[PDB]
Design a protein around this ligand. Sequence first.
Ligand SMILES: CCOC(=O)CC[C@H](C[C@@H]1CCNC1=O)NC(=O)[C@@H](CC(=O)[C@@H](NC(=O)c1cc(C)on1)C(C)C)Cc1ccc(F)cc1
Length: 176
Amino acid sequence: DFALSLLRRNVRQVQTDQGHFTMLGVRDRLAVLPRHSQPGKTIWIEHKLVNVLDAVELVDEQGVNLDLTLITLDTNEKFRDITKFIPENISTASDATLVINTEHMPSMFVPVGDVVQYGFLNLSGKPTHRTMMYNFPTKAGQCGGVVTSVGKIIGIHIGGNGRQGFCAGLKRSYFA
Ligand SMILES: CCOC(=O)CC[C@H](C[C@@H]1CCNC1=O)NC(=O)[C@@H](CC(=O)[C@@H](NC(=O)c1cc(C)on1)C(C)C)Cc1ccc(F)cc1
């Protein structure tokens, strides 16, 4: 129920020069993407070209790569504010669902099971922190996917090795 309404109201198909991604709209004109999507000044959102007002790579007190980029979109439409569904602290989970929505992989829900603390992750040679892991064969095209569990939004899909998948953890304070 919660995953379905999240998909409808907040999860959008996008394309950058790096390919297809799922984008989570967070509130108003603010949305989050995996860093490796490398959004430019213009982004493709559901068959429309959209101006990107600002893009900031997510940094926390530690000053390390979290593999997320916050963008502000030049749009009329305002995302439903879902920050209250993002935990105040990075949260592991059981019975999690990955919500993917791109032009090539539209509106798909994947039960990934337990989402456990993982932390540091070397993603194709690039150091990444505060990740969590699920034992599910995620694949190319699923980055940006939104990890959800029991009414909470807990991560964004960023990588996998064919047998396991990994997400960047989400905390409410990222979007304050
Ligand atoms: C161009 C296509 O891009 C996409 O489709 C983005 C979505 C995917 C989905 C992967 C695609 C596959 N199974 C998955 O779940 N992500 C990646 O491909 C990335 C890297 C991998 O996952 C690497 N995995 C690990 O390093 C890795 C380490 C451990 C441990 O587990 N995986 C590759 C070796 C697959 C892209 C990337 C490159 C440089 C970075 F700075 C950061 C990220």
